Write a protein that binds this ligand. Structure first.
Ligand SMILES: *[C@@H]1O[C@H](CO)[C@@H](O)[C@H](O)[C@H]1NC(C)=O
Ligand SMILES: *[C@@H]1O[C@H](CO)[C@@H](O)[C@H](O)[C@H]1NC(C)=O
Lengths: 380, 380
């Protein structure tokens, strides 16, 4: 059961992105950007030629970047101009799905940097160092589906989830998680000087009854006491989708200990995925290995629960820990027209119909649902 | 729509096998064997300790073999004793699904030959030659799902469809078709003297919308003018099944021309899968290759139509060409409780409910459905 109150726009404005910046909702739409907070929907127009606003990251001010008519360009929050004139790798050249995260002041994104569009995963210039980019064909043309930053004890690391499409005898999709060192310095050489030197990846695995799911929809890493737990949502070309959970501690341990797939010899002293003390640069042997064989000979198996299967075609999902109990969540996952909630404790799924073209669910303290009608806020 | 008239037994007798011998239905049940012809249901008791009758092949007389209490033993049709005392590889040691075909006088079967039960595909002693068996781990523990004999222009060849379960990093099922020379003489050596020397296999492929099906249920090869067409029915751990069709001419061409997967060098003069003139024996080099790399570097892609998708859990399927048109069939596929027909021309699927625990559909001139209640015969 769910009662949602609707703060709608004046018109049905095609949603293009939704972000949470310090419990303030930033809904990038065509034309303006909407700002939800305290049930207050402040719309701010920027331009309207094409200008699909897609990015609303926060570095120092929450700058907001869009694509004004095939030219990507940023702004300050209130339509003002960006001092640093950011905007190349911050917004796509055309309306697309993006993945752009911002740590302290360090923007990482998969957004296309040029017009042609070779897919790469980049960290842009800032406190971490100069720009970086993954070698080609590493990131699939579909893009990076999830990205989040997590401590590795002492060094920040960036994790990204994507779905590769291998094609040898038949096309097989494979879900991957990939780790990189947030403060990587680049490779050793001059050509490989702006390339990640700590990029590694493992296959995930979400099997239930011999049906293995392989297409990532969306991810979210909740931070708990002993470690953080990663919730992935897989879709399938069949009529099903499946939420799995993985223990980031198990993943980190696997990254640090497992062996590189296809590489049989002894791994060098600064082990490939390992972060390095500030200013250090990966040697050449380690880098040659880490670029040739960048996949561990392993497979991350999910936690025991909650694995569950919902409909096919879910688009978003967000978690909200129940205030009464603890480590028991309500996972609100959203389809084009129908809300669904799932309680990790009772393992029952509730549903609800809503006559709108939903786009996302965000959760700050109460699930707010971003649909083309406008925003809604939910109370059961 | 379908009206079926029911010739039922006196009791609900657990069906264990059904065969068509010259348009006579032979229904092996627990205890007796039933014989349907001209709407006449002649039951013939043989023994009743355990005696799950499973085989009703025809060599010279249609002998019928069962498993009398963990001892496999054959009989003549009318309960009489077998002169040659056949019965080892003709009936399983316990109730199981079997695959046993009979060409002219040459019984081929995957039935377990001993108590332990290593799965192999065997040709038994008779006009073709002495017994033969496939090397171990070639046939999956699930068994061989379909088998039929087809000319290769001049030499008879045996084709078998099974589903391998490869397990390297995750478990993947792979459907395979495999060809052997019916009059193979065995390998060259003394150890490999009763092993097939002409065994090869390719992957099939039944993909529809990026969903690839890999679990074979049942096969049937219809013989047409220019060639024969192979109808395979795949199941999936998801909620779907798919019928595909393959052109045996394409398969034969692929077997004769394609290259052995993993073998990069030049194939020897008596090409591996190639039948040999009577009395000839495969050389040693050809045999070493054919045993090491017995899979072609290829994949058989289905015909254009009819590919279709029906429910998950279908158990049988049989074809009946429409009397009016030609090359247009009615495919009756049967589920545990529900009949389904599918017309290749109209591409519409009809269904029908029947309150019985169906076991199979046979088609002689009118589809007769073998359920535990008894036999039924259908007219639309
Ligand atoms: C929304 O706009 C009104 C209009 O001035 C302003 O008073 C209010 O502070 C704004 N709130 C936010 C969260 O921007
Ligand atoms: C069925 O049994 C009857 C009983 O004698 C016999 O006359 C008839 O020929 C049998 N038919 C077949 C097909 O066995």
């Amino acid at each position: 059961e769910l009662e949602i109150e609707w703060h709608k726009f004046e018109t049905s404005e095609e949603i293009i992105s939704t972000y949470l910046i310090d419990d303030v909702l930033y809904t990038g739409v065509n034309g303006a950007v909407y700002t939800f907070s305290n049930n207050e929907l402040n719309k701010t127009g920027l331009t309207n030629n094409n200008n699909y606003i897609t990015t609303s990251i926060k570095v120092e001010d929450t700058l907001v970047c869009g694509t004004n008519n095939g030219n990507p360009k940023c702004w300050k929050i209130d339509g003002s101009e960006d001092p640093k004139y950011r905007g190349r790798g911050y917004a796509p050249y055309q309306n697309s799905k993006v993945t752009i995260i911002s740590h302290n002041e360090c923007v990482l994104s998969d957004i296309n940097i040029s017009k042609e569009g070779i897919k790469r995963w980049r960290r842009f210039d800032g406190p971490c160092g100069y720009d970086l980019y993954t070698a080609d064909n590493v990131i699939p043309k579909d893009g990076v589906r999830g990205a989040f930053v997590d401590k590795d004890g002492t060094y920040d690391k960036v994790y990204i989830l994507f779905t590769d499409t291998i094609d040898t005898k038949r096309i097989v999709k494979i879900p991957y998680i990939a780790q990189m060192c947030l403060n990587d310095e680049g490779g050793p050489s001059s050509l490989s000087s702006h390339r990640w030197s700590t990029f590694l990846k493992v296959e995930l695995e979400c099997d239930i009854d011999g049906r293995s799911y392989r297409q990532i929809i969306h991810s979210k890493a909740i931070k708990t006491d002993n470690d953080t737990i990663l919730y992935v949502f897989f879709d399938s070309p069949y009529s099903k989708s499946a939420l799995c959970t993985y223990s980031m501690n198990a993943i980190k341990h696997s990254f640090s200990t497992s062996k590189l797939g296809g590489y049989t010899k002894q791994l060098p002293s600064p082990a490939p995925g390992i972060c390095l003390p500030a200013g250090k640069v990966v040697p050449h042997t380690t880098f040659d290995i880490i670029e040739q064989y960048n996949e561990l000979d392993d497979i991350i198996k999910p936690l025991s629960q909650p694995i569950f299967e919902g409909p096919s075609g879910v688009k978003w999902f967000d978690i909200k820990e129940k205030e009464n109990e603890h480590r028991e969540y309500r996972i609100y996952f959203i389809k084009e027209n129908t809300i669904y909630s799932f309680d990790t404790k009772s393992k029952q799924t509730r549903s609800a119909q809503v006559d709108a073209r939903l786009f996302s669910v965000m959760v700050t303290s109460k699930p707010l649902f971003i649909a083309d009608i406008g925003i809604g806020v939910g109370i059961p």
